[PDB]
Structures are given as structure tokens and as C-alpha cells.
RNA sequence: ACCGUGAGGGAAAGGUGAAAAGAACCUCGAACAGAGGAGUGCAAUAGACCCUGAACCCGUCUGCCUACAAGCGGUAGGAG
RNA sequence: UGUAGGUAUAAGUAACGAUAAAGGGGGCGAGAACCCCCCUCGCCGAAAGACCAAGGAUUCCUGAUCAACGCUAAUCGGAUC
RNA sequence: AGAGAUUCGCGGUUAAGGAACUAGGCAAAAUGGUCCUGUAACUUCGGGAGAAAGGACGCCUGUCAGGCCGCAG
RNA sequence: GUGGUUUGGCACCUGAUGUCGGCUCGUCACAUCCUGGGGCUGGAGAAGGUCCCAAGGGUUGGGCUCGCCCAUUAAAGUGGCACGCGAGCUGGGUUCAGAACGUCGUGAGACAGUUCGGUCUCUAUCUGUUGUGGGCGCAGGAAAUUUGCGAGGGUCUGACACUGACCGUGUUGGACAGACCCCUGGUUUACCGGUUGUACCGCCAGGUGCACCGCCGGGUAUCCACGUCUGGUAAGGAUAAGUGCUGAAAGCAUCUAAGCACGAAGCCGGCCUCAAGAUAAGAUUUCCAUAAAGGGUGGUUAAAGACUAUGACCUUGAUAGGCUGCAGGUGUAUGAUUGGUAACAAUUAAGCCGAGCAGUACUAAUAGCCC
């Protein structure tokens, strides 16, 4: 469940690494955005010598939240951070690497090459 | 009569499984979709809650991959789960491990029972 | 059409292809014709239904004069149907079959009863002000109600404070999981009004 | 909304409910029919019996379990021996109310809670 | 706030139309002969329904 | 009297009966709390707050009207 | 927006003055949630305990009384004699 | 004395987010004890300073070491 | 020419008609922001421009204080209602007493100015509105099931795929609303456990009181949303703007005057709830006076409830409690063996609770009195 002004940590290789939810996308009073969903995010700080830059504003696809996301099967499943990967402007990832794990849910999203992750749960 | 333990009974799924507590450390396989080849998956961790009435239970298991702490929520009657092993007992005092979400390393163990 | 039941409870199943549904039991049990009524000397054509075995001691005698004409066992619950396809005699069973061949159906019944409740829970209103910043004492108020002096009065259907709850409500296109004849059950998915033991009316 | 809530409040915190109660446990034991309100007396009947049955099972477990709910020596000794001796054999309600009418200070209405074993013209 | 005029006899009568004393529910004593209150122990012969209550 | 530290300010309040002859005694009631009698007296609906005893205001009984009806409440018609 | 006295209306309404708390058994009595005795509970305890002074002026003790006073009743009282 | 509607007074807990509230972080939350380390610009040389920032804390045994319990000393 | 929403003119209402903006709650109009239907184009398609019909529903969150900016959206419309709404809120702005700067004045002081600070009273009588009862009537007395004169609500919309498009197609979301608690998540001063200080029960053990529920960790039912299901949809009929057929007046022509086809989220309906005090008081079935024909008062109570009202049961009774078993919460009590020097650890196996379910007359539910 992120919202506007909620923090994420930048989970790809990019050199950002905390990003700032400016909006969520997808029809007017939208309030959540879960796993799968785009958001636009301001990126409040980097890596020394990084390609993008402090204060940019991109489009993110967030991979891992907080709070529990019900599967069809009856099934759940909750990370312990709040993270994005960072997209460019015709909806590819920026970077080259992902950290951590990422839900599976990022499969139906065309996402597929995101889901060349490090694990998929 | 009771009708609710009727409909039970009459919709009831899944395969028996070792008997196990919060505080175990247990391996579940989980039946996934890859597309269309159907796939087993294995994840290991430990019980840190168990709820629900009788065969309706739901149990959840947390594990820690890339220093990310993940949590999932199985239902017992579950079709897609194929095998529970144990691999390890736990010892604890207390029915939710809770605490464990702000440990990590060697403050997060839990000490085997025989 | 339809019969009379009683909602029991609700469970979790697993359907065939692996999926979770939350279905609502209910007992819609032997429903019996206790009376006719025609076009010609009612004016429209329905069917009544008593559904719960009554005995003497709880059945007034006009209550028991009108079972008798009927031939049947005093009944607890009875309502009107209407549109059956088909001839339906006086004194005749209706059970839980049928509704075997039907794939949706509408529930009716009475919802639980809060009581009297305010602005905020009745109708969701926003509430007056923050809870600091020099909140005196209308956190659950209702703000303004009417528009100075030249209406110079509060309209019809202002939404005040009362009475929630404890009313007829009806539930579309619930789909029929499963049918039991051998224990009058029926298997919805989703919820119905009302609490449990509470006489419902289910339409096909 | 109250719907399946079954205790009575009483007018008082918990603590000070709790108290009455016991208080009201050792009294009844203590002399065998007391006077009291209605309400008082419905709540007493609901505490109260539970402890009765405890006596069924004369243990110091038992014993020491009673004690914590009563705290009263001379309750406890009556009460696992005169009374437990009395209400053997009998499985539950050892309690009985009867209305007796209202108080001239705030026309409360009145009554007395007594044990059924130690009035002998009810039989 | 304020009550713009004072009311008249008769609207403080029509309002207080629903004002009246409840009155007791009694039974009568089929052998004792008196009146007591219906589910209440009849103080006058201490009994309740056939049986002897408190003991005067 | 009361009010004010003080200088000071500053009320309300008359009438049983000719004569106390001011009601022994009885009844209800825990009690004169009060009343109903008895007795005194021209009179007690003169009984102690007592001559006379108005209005606003408050009750009970009797007669007529009144639960499909809408504005200064009356006025002029008019059945029962 | 006149003065004194009496009586209304709002109305059997607001309120009955710190959320430290009460329960039971006996006594007296015509009458008891509240008065007296006992048991249990709770509150204060650098005080809400014990003293000096200012100020008050019989409120102190006992017997009768429950009209008025006591924000309820009272057999009780710093109330009346 | 009951009862446990709305609403108000005084309090308690709250998923995910964390000032997006608002004129304004108002109110609340948070910090907080003892001991040991270690403390910047600037300065009127006294200060700033408890700057900031870290670490230990219960019980048992033995001349600080070992052991034991809890989510938390 | 229209309007009265800008700046004005007039001075007719006022022993107080008492305040800008914001919040809350709305309601109305259309001079239409989006969505729907069309005429024309200097309209090839694709989007655009302009005009007509149309007001049903929608019409974001922030950094700043009319307007600018950031990110979205189908869209971020214009106005009226005492510049809607302070006996509903706030008090940032504005009329007050303190103080300071600039400027003006000899001075007291003043200002198209600026700046820091600065009390928002009232127990709702009538009417209005939202809920809920009592009486009588219909009706000689009743228990039920109903028809619908009418009233209210509901009506939004995106993306994608197949055939730089017409049309047709399907696969899916956002928002909003209703119900519900199987799931997830919250509460849970019922309940269970750990622990600090202190007091008491000679001592100890075991409890208990108090310290915000002392603090801390959990937590069933109930109540909930952050959760789960369901819904909005087409156009049945008459139409608006427009498109046509046959056709005189006016031998030609003409969508029209007699006629006939279409054609909108707009109107009346379908859908949901209320509804015979609809005094036009409707209909159908059954029963009719006294015991339990119908009730009242009463009792045990409830997923019903402010009080009422409503539901179940009242002894040939499972209504509530207790009792016996379970689902479940908590997490291994007291003691005894067993090891340790101890703090402690293992077995015996837990104990306590159980607002839920099932069984069981042990307790309480007296047909007493009145229509
Ligand atoms: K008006
Ligand atoms: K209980
Ligand atoms: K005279
Ligand atoms: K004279
Ligand atoms: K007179
Ligand atoms: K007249
Ligand atoms: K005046
Ligand atoms: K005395
Ligand atoms: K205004
Ligand atoms: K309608
Ligand atoms: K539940
Ligand atoms: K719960
Ligand atoms: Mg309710
Ligand atoms: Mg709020
Ligand atoms: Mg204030
Ligand atoms: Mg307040
Ligand atoms: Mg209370
Ligand atoms: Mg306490
Ligand atoms: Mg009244
Ligand atoms: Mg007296
Ligand atoms: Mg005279
Ligand atoms: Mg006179
Ligand atoms: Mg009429
Ligand atoms: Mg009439
Ligand atoms: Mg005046
Ligand atoms: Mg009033
Ligand atoms: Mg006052
Ligand atoms: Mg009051
Ligand atoms: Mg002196
Ligand atoms: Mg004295
Ligand atoms: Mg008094
Ligand atoms: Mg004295
Ligand atoms: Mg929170
Ligand atoms: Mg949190
Ligand atoms: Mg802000
Ligand atoms: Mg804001
Ligand atoms: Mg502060
Ligand atoms: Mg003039
Ligand atoms: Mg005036
Ligand atoms: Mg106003
Ligand atoms: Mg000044
Ligand atoms: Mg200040
Ligand atoms: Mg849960
Ligand atoms: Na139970
Ligand atoms: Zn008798």
C-alpha cells in the first residue's frame, strides 16, 4: 500500500537508491498502489558518480511492499521493504541488476524482464 | 445437524500432513504455473503463526533471501501444497513469534528441541 | 420464483481449478403450498409457502383454520411467490432441487440492526474540522443544514441522525456453488443479509 | 452496539466489579441467603457457581484455585466443607432468586439469592 | 435557545396528555386472601408459589 | 433586620370573638401530620396565617362540541 | 426596557458541586441505600495524619424533637429547645 | 437505581503510509537514569557543552571470567 | 436589445439585520468541462474549428497565497442561494486597548503604509428536518398473507485485443454505494502468560490489592476496513436537434399542412426500498368472547432496542443461566522424579479460560388480575 509521499528503496542498479511517490497512476482519487502497479517517484538520493541524477523525476514499477498481497489460490505473501525499479520513458528498466526478491505478480504486468531476479515468490 | 461440518467434510481437499508448531522449522512445496509447464517450487522457514479452526488453518512461514525478510500464508486444505517436511524443532515459549522481525543473524535463532 | 431458508453460516472451499470462494450455507428446507391465489378472484396469481414446522401451542385458530383448509401441518414462516413455471396443487412440497438447474440467484432478507447511529456511520460524513487545530467539540457533527433565509427552512431528505439497520435488503446474481437435497442445503458464493437463523426469501 | 457481550458492567470499573463480586461470593457463602438488587444478584449467579462446582474436587489445586478467586480464609473453609458436603451430587444451579419488592430510598428492585440446599420448605 | 412566546394552558395540557402513574401489577392470594405483587413473594404469609419463602 | 472596611444606605410587618368561653371526650392514623365528630359560641365556611375574602393563577363535577382538519381566534348568519 | 406584592411560562426540564468505591450481616425504629455495631473492599499517608498563631464565638458534651435548615430520605447532624 | 443509543468530557490501542494536516508539527508521539568513551563552527577565552555521536546495565557461581532466564534487565 | 455577476447612481427597510477566506453539509440553473446525438467546414482519413439538441451522473492530490507552478485525469466547467451556510466549526485576515519602523505634524497625534501580540456567549419554545411510539378511525371483534394511488434511490467512466480508420466484437480495471466476517488486517479494561516496586496472609511457598488495564507479549465472540462478495449496465414507449418516403397549397419544387419511418447519458418505465390515515381508509384466507377468538399487565430473554416497538420461550418447557462435553485463546501451572553447586533445565501431561456449538430440567420462566 503506497501512497503519495511514501519512500521506496530502488531495487535495480541504477544509481539511485530512495525514491519519493509523487503520484499513482491509473484514474482520478487512486489512492494504493501495490506490486505491479506504476508510480511516478522523485529520487532523493544517489550513489556518488551515478547516471541519473538527485531530484529527477522518472516512472517506477514497484516489486516488493509491506503489506500482504492475496494470491487467487488463497495464498498471501509480505516483504519487509517497500521497493521499486526505475523505468525510462517507453517502459524499460534503466538498469542492469536486481537485488532481493520480487513477487511473482510482476510476471503478467510485462515485466518479464524484471523477473530475471536474483528469486520470484 | 450441523450442516457447516457437512459441507466441510463434503468439500474437503488437500493431503494429510507432520504434525508441526510455531517455533519448527519446516519445507513446503507449492505447486506453481510457469506459463504452461507446471512447476514445483521449495520454500523453507520457520512457523512463526498458526490460526484458523480445525482443517481450515492457515500457517505462516517467514524466511529471509538476500537480507529481505519474506513472509507467506498457506492454507492447510491447500491443493497446491505437495509436501511438509520438518526439517528442524523449535523451542519457544509463546504461540506468535512476532519478535522475530526485528532480528537478524544470530539474534534470530531458535534453539532445537532434542 | 423461489422458496423460504435459513442462513446457517459461512465457510471456505477450493473450487476445481484450485480457487478460494467464500460460500454462504443455507437451510432452504420442504416449503409447503399453503395457499392459491388466481386472476380471477385475487386479482393476480401467486403462490404462498409456509416453511417451518409450528406446533399447536404457537398457532392462533385462524392461523390453524387456515392450515386445515390447506390439509398441512401448521407452519412457522409464510410468503408469497410468484411466476412458476408449471401447476402447483394445494398442500404440495417444494425442496432445495428445485433449484438444481439454476446458476444465479437473489437473496432477500433483513439486515442486523444498529440502532441509532450518527451522521458519520449512517452516511459517512466527512466530520467537522481536524481532531487538533482548535477542535472544540464538533469532531462527529454534521455541519451546516440548511442555506440562510431564503429557503429560510431544512429540505426533505436532509441525511440526519437514526435509526440503521434492521431493514429488508436484496443481493443480485450470487452464483449456486452446490446443491445438497440429501440435507435441504444450498452453497452461495458471497454474503447474505442478515444474521445467522434469519429467514431468507432466495429468487432463481 | 452490545450484540453478544454477556456480563454486566454494573455501573463500576473493573477492578471495583471485580471486588463486589468476590465480596458478594464470601457473603453468600459465609450466611447462606443475602438480600440484594436484581442485577447484583443475576451477575452474583453467573460468578459465583463456577466456584461451587470447584469443590467437587477436593485438592489443594483446587483449593488454592478457589482462594484466588474468594481471598477470604473463613469463606474457603466453609465452602469446602459444609457447603461442598451440601451440594455433592447436584449438577448445578445451587442458586436461587426470588423478587421481594423495592427500596423506599430510589425504588430499587429488591431480592435475596440463597442456596437451594440450605432452605428446607422448598424442598 | 429561547422560547419566542410563552405557551398557553392548553398546549402545556396536550403536551402533558402522556403523563400518568403506572399502575402496580397485583395478584391475588388464592389462600391467603390479599393482594401481592404477580412474581413476588407475598410478604404478609412469607410464601411463593405454594411453598414457604422466609420464615417469619 | 439586612448591606458596607468605613463614612453611609436602609426595609417588610395592624384586624379571632361581646366575652378565651382558644375546642373535655370519641374515631382513623406511629403521631393531631391532618381530618371527621362531640362541645363552646349569634356564627368555627369566626379555630389561632383566624373580619370581609376580588383578580391573575390552579382543580373537581355537570351540559354541549371535538381525532380529513390550515392563518390576530372574532364578527354576521345558522341546524342539532 | 415604568414601581411593589402575588401568580404563571419555559418544565416535572437544567441541575443535586471533583470518576477516592463500595458489598453484606446484625441493632433500633411506624418508616432505613444513607443512623449505630461487626466483617470484607477502596483512598490519603511531607497528608486528606498531629500541633502553634490569626480569625470565628458555644459550633464542645448529654437528653428530648424532625416543623424549618441539610441540594434525596433520615431514627442522623456543625439543625431547634 | 437500572441500562450500556447518538453525541460530548477524560483516557487506551491501531494495518500500510509518515506532516501528505494546518496560518503554523497546534496537540500527541518521541528523548529521558547511572557509569565509561568521545565531543564542531565560533568566542568577550569564562564558554558553546549534558554539543553531537557511540557502549555497559537482570540473576547465579568463582577469583573480570564462566553460566542461566525473558520479546524486553 | 437582454441580464443584474463589475464599477457606479438613489437613500426606500434595519432600544445591533453582527464578521473575509477556509471546513462541513448541501441545493438549484445552464451561458456544457467530460461523457451521449447531430448540421456545416477553406472536413481526403486522423484528430481539429464553429453551430444546434441535451443538465442524468461525474468533475484529483500537492508547493505557494485572484493567480502561478508540480504530477495526474475522461474531465479538473461557469454561476445563484443575505458575495449559501460562525444560536454548525475555525480565527490565518479584519473594527479594540501594548509596542516598533518609514512618512506627515511645533505638539497632542495621524497615515494610499508595514511589523510582533491580542476573550468567538446562549440548557431549542414554535416552525423545519431525521428517526420512533401512544390514541382513535376504516370496523362488530381479530390472526395472517397481500395489490399498489404515490414517494424516494439508483443512472459515472478508462485501458487493451480482433476486424490511419466507419461499424461490430470481447478481455478487464478506477471511483462510488449496499451487504457481510469464511479469508487478510484492527479492536477486544472477557481471558491467558512474563515481569518491576510495594503491602498483607509469624517465615517460605502460592496467591491477591495498588502503581495509566503498572508495564510488556498474545488474544475467541462481538463491532469493523485496510478485507470479501454484489451492483451501475441495455434502451421497452413517446420524443429533442437532425435524416427520409408519398404530397397539394403555388400544374414545378417542398421532411408536412392529412399521413408514414427513424433518430439522444435527456422524459416516462424496467431495477431497489417505503407505501391503504390512498378518511377514494382496498383485496384474499381463516377464526369469533374467556380460557389460554384475540389481547393487556407479568416472567426468562435476544444476533431487537435510547424509552418504546419487535422476535423467541413461559413446565407435554431447551427461553436464559448452571452442569457435562467439544471448536477455540493462552502456552507447559501446582507438585513428584530426573540432572546441576546453584541460578535453572527435561519427563509426568499441563493448568486456567471457553461471549461460540451440542447435550441435559439442577435454578428461574405461577394464565394470578384486567379488556
Ligand atoms: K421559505
Ligand atoms: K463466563
Ligand atoms: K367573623
Ligand atoms: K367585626
Ligand atoms: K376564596
Ligand atoms: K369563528
Ligand atoms: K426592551
Ligand atoms: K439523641
Ligand atoms: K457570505
Ligand atoms: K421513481
Ligand atoms: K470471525
Ligand atoms: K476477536
Ligand atoms: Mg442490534
Ligand atoms: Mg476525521
Ligand atoms: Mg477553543
Ligand atoms: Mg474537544
Ligand atoms: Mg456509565
Ligand atoms: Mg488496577
Ligand atoms: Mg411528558
Ligand atoms: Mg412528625
Ligand atoms: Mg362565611
Ligand atoms: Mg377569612
Ligand atoms: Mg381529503
Ligand atoms: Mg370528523
Ligand atoms: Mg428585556
Ligand atoms: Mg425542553
Ligand atoms: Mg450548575
Ligand atoms: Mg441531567
Ligand atoms: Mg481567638
Ligand atoms: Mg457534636
Ligand atoms: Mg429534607
Ligand atoms: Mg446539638
Ligand atoms: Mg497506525
Ligand atoms: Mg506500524
Ligand atoms: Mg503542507
Ligand atoms: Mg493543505
Ligand atoms: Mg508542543
Ligand atoms: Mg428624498
Ligand atoms: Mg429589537
Ligand atoms: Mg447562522
Ligand atoms: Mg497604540
Ligand atoms: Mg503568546
Ligand atoms: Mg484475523
Ligand atoms: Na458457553
Ligand atoms: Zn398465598
Not at chain 2, 26 to 52: D, F
Given at each position: 500500500?503506497?501512497?503519495?509521499?511514501?519512500?521506496?528503496?530502488?531495487?535495480?542498479?541504477?544509481?539511485?537508491?530512495?525514491?519519493?511517490?509523487?503520484?499513482?497512476?491509473?484514474?482520478?482519487?487512486?489512492?494504493?498502489?501495490?506490486?505491479?502497479?506504476?508510480?511516478?517517484?522523485?529520487?532523493?538520493?544517489?550513489?556518488?558518480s551515478s547516471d541519473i541524477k538527485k531530484g529527477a523525476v522518472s516512472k517506477a514499477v514497484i516489486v516488493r511492499t509491506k503489506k500482504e498481497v492475496r494470491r487467487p489460490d488463497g495464498s498471501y505473501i509480505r516483504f519487509d521493504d517497500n521497493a521499486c525499479v526505475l523505468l525510462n520513458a517507453a517502459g524499460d528498466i534503466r538498469g542492469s541488476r536486481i537485488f532481493g526478491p520480487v513477487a511473482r505478480e510482476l510476471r503478467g504486468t510485462n515485466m518479464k524482464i524484471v523477473s530475471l531476479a536474483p528469486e520470484v515468490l | 445437524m450441523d450442516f457447516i461440518k457437512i459441507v466441510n467434510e463434503e468439500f474437503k481437499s488437500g493431503k494429510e500432513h507432520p504434525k508441526f508448531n510455531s517455533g519448527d522449522t519446516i519445507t513446503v512445496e507449492y505447486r506453481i504455473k510457469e506459463g504452461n509447464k507446471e512447476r514445483i517450487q521449495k520454500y523453507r522457514g520457520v512457523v512463526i503463526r498458526i490460526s484458523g479452526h480445525?482443517?481450515?488453518?492457515?500457517?505462516?512461514?517467514?524466511?529471509?533471501?538476500?537480507?529481505?525478510?519474506?513472509?507467506?500464508?498457506?492454507?492447510?486444505?491447500?491443493?497446491?501444497?505437495?509436501?511438509?517436511?520438518?526439517?528442524?524443532?523449535?523451542?519457544?515459549?509463546?504461540?506468535?513469534?512476532?519478535?522475530?522481525?526485528?532480528?537478524?543473524?544470530?539474534?534470530?535463532?531458535?534453539?532445537?528441541?532434542? | 420464483?423461489?422458496?423460504?431458508?435459513?442462513?446457517?453460516?459461512?465457510?471456505?472451499?477450493?473450487?476445481?481449478?484450485?480457487?478460494?470462494?467464500?460460500?454462504?450455507?443455507?437451510?432452504?428446507?420442504?416449503?409447503?403450498?399453503?395457499?392459491?391465489?388466481?386472476?380471477?378472484?385475487?386479482?393476480?396469481?401467486?403462490?404462498?409457502?409456509?416453511?417451518?414446522?409450528?406446533?399447536?401451542?404457537?398457532?392462533?385458530?385462524?392461523?390453524?383454520?387456515?392450515?386445515?383448509?390447506?390439509?398441512?401441518?401448521?407452519?412457522?414462516?409464510?410468503?408469497?411467490?410468484?411466476?412458476?413455471?408449471?401447476?402447483?396443487?394445494?398442500?404440495?412440497?417444494?425442496?432445495?432441487?428445485?433449484?438444481?438447474?439454476?446458476?444465479?440467484?437473489?437473496?432477500?432478507?433483513?439486515?442486523?440492526?444498529?440502532?441509532?447511529?450518527?451522521?458519520?456511520?449512517?452516511?459517512?460524513?466527512?466530520?467537522?474540522?481536524?481532531?487538533?487545530?482548535?477542535?472544540?467539540?464538533?469532531?462527529?457533527?454534521?455541519?451546516?443544514?440548511?442555506?440562510?433565509?431564503?429557503?429560510?427552512?431544512?429540505?426533505?431528505?436532509?441525511?440526519?441522525?437514526?435509526?440503521?439497520?434492521?431493514?429488508?435488503?436484496?443481493?443480485?446474481?450470487?452464483?449456486?456453488?452446490?446443491?445438497?437435497?440429501?440435507?435441504?442445503?444450498?452453497?452461495?458464493?458471497?454474503?447474505?443479509?442478515?444474521?445467522?437463523?434469519?429467514?431468507?426469501?432466495?429468487?432463481? | 452496539?452490545?450484540?453478544?457481550?454477556?456480563?454486566?458492567?454494573?455501573?463500576?470499573?473493573?477492578?471495583?466489579?471485580?471486588?463486589?463480586?468476590?465480596?458478594?461470593?464470601?457473603?453468600?457463602?459465609?450466611?447462606?441467603?443475602?438480600?440484594?438488587?436484581?442485577?447484583?444478584?443475576?451477575?452474583?449467579?453467573?460468578?459465583?457457581?463456577?466456584?461451587?462446582?470447584?469443590?467437587?474436587?477436593?485438592?489443594?489445586?483446587?483449593?488454592?484455585?478457589?482462594?484466588?478467586?474468594?481471598?477470604?480464609?473463613?469463606?474457603?473453609?466453609?465452602?469446602?466443607?459444609?457447603?461442598?458436603?451440601?451440594?455433592?451430587?447436584?449438577?448445578?444451579?445451587?442458586?436461587?432468586?426470588?423478587?421481594?419488592?423495592?427500596?423506599?430510598?430510589?425504588?430499587?428492585?429488591?431480592?435475596?439469592?440463597?442456596?437451594?440446599?440450605?432452605?428446607?420448605?422448598?424442598? | 435557545?429561547?422560547?419566542?412566546?410563552?405557551?398557553?394552558?392548553?398546549?402545556?395540557?396536550?403536551?402533558?396528555?402522556?403523563?400518568?402513574?403506572?399502575?402496580?401489577?397485583?395478584?391475588?392470594?388464592?389462600?391467603?386472601?390479599?393482594?401481592?405483587?404477580?412474581?413476588?413473594?407475598?410478604?404478609?404469609?412469607?410464601?411463593?408459589?405454594?411453598?414457604?419463602?422466609?420464615?417469619?
Amino acid at each position: 500500500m503506497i501512497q503519495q509521499e511514501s519512500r521506496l528503496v530502488v531495487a535495480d542498479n541504477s544509481g539511485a537508491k530512495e525514491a519519493l511517490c509523487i503520484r499513482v497512476l491509473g484514474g482520478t482519487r487512486r489512492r494504493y498502489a501495490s506490486v505491479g502497479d506504476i508510480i511516478v517517484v522523485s529520487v532523493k538520493s544517489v550513489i556518488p558518480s551515478s547516471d541519473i541524477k538527485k531530484g529527477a523525476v522518472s516512472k517506477a514499477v514497484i516489486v516488493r511492499t509491506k503489506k500482504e498481497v492475496r494470491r487467487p489460490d488463497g495464498s498471501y505473501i509480505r516483504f519487509d521493504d517497500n521497493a521499486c525499479v526505475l523505468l525510462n520513458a517507453a517502459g524499460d528498466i534503466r538498469g542492469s541488476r536486481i537485488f532481493g526478491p520480487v513477487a511473482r505478480e510482476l510476471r503478467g504486468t510485462n515485466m518479464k524482464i524484471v523477473s530475471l531476479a536474483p528469486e520470484v515468490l | 445437524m450441523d450442516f457447516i461440518k457437512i459441507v466441510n467434510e463434503e468439500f474437503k481437499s488437500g493431503k494429510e500432513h507432520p504434525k508441526f508448531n510455531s517455533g519448527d522449522t519446516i519445507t513446503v512445496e507449492y505447486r506453481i504455473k510457469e506459463g504452461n509447464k507446471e512447476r514445483i517450487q521449495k520454500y523453507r522457514g520457520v512457523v512463526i503463526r498458526i490460526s484458523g479452526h480445525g482443517d481450515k488453518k492457515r500457517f505462516t512461514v517467514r524466511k529471509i533471501s538476500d537480507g529481505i525478510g519474506v513472509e507467506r500464508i498457506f492454507p492447510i486444505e491447500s491443493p497446491f501444497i505437495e509436501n511438509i517436511t520438518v526439517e528442524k524443532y523449535g523451542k519457544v515459549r509463546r504461540a506468535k513469534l512476532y519478535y522475530l522481525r526485528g532480528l537478524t543473524g544470530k539474534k534470530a535463532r531458535i534453539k532445537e528441541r532434542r | 420464483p423461489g422458496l423460504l431458508g435459513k442462513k446457517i453460516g459461512m465457510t471456505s472451499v477450493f473450487s476445481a481449478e484450485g480457487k478460494n470462494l467464500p460460500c454462504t450455507v443455507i437451510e432452504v428446507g420442504p416449503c409447503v403450498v399453503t395457499q392459491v391465489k388466481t386472476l380471477e378472484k385475487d386479482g393476480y396469481s401467486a403462490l404462498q409457502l409456509g416453511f417451518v414446522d409450528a406446533k399447536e401451542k404457537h398457532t392462533t385458530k385462524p392461523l390453524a383454520g387456515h392450515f386445515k383448509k390447506a390439509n398441512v401441518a401448521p407452519k412457522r414462516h409464510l410468503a408469497e411467490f410468484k411466476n412458476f413455471e408449471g401447476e402447483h396443487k394445494l398442500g404440495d412440497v417444494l425442496n432445495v432441487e428445485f433449484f438444481s438447474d439454476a446458476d444465479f440467484v437473489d437473496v432477500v432478507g433483513t439486515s442486523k440492526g444498529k440502532g441509532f447511529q450518527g451522521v458519520v456511520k449512517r452516511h459517512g460524513f466527512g466530520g467537522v474540522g481536524q481532531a487538533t487545530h482548535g477542535q472544540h467539540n464538533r469532531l462527529r457533527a454534521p455541519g451546516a443544514v440548511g442555506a440562510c433565509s431564503y429557503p429560510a427552512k431544512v429540505f426533505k431528505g436532509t441525511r440526519m441522525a437514526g435509526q440503521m439497520g434492521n431493514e429488508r435488503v436484496t443481493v443480485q446474481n450470487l452464483e449456486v456453488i452446490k446443491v445438497m437435497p440429501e440435507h435441504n442445503l444450498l452453497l452461495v458464493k458471497g454474503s447474505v443479509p442478515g444474521a445467522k437463523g434469519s429467514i431468507l426469501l432466495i429468487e432463481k | 452496539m452490545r450484540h453478544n457481550k454477556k456480563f454486566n458492567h454494573l455501573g463500576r470499573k473493573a477492578a471495583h466489579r471485580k471486588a463486589m463480586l468476590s465480596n458478594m461470593a464470601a457473603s453468600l457463602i459465609l450466611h447462606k441467603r443475602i438480600f440484594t438488587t436484581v442485577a447484583k444478584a443475576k451477575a452474583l449467579r453467573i460468578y459465583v457457581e463456577p466456584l461451587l462446582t470447584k469443590t467437587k474436587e477436593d485438592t489443594t489445586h483446587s483449593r488454592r484455585i478457589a482462594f484466588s478467586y474468594l481471598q477470604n480464609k473463613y469463606a474457603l473453609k466453609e465452602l469446602f466443607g459444609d457447603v461442598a458436603a451440601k451440594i455433592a451430587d447436584r449438577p448445578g444451579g445451587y442458586t436461587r432468586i426470588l423478587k421481594t419488592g423495592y427500596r423506599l430510598g430510589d425504588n430499587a428492585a429488591m431480592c435475596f439469592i440463597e442456596l437451594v440446599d440450605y432452605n428446607e420448605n422448598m424442598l | 435557545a429561547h422560547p419566542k412566546r410563552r405557551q398557553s394552558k392548553t398546549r402545556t395540557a396536550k403536551r402533558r396528555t402522556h403523563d400518568k402513574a403506572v399502575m402496580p401489577t397485583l395478584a391475588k392470594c388464592p389462600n391467603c386472601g390479599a393482594w401481592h405483587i404477580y412474581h413476588t413473594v407475598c410478604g404478609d404469609c412469607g410464601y411463593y408459589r405454594g411453598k414457604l419463602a422466609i420464615e417469619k
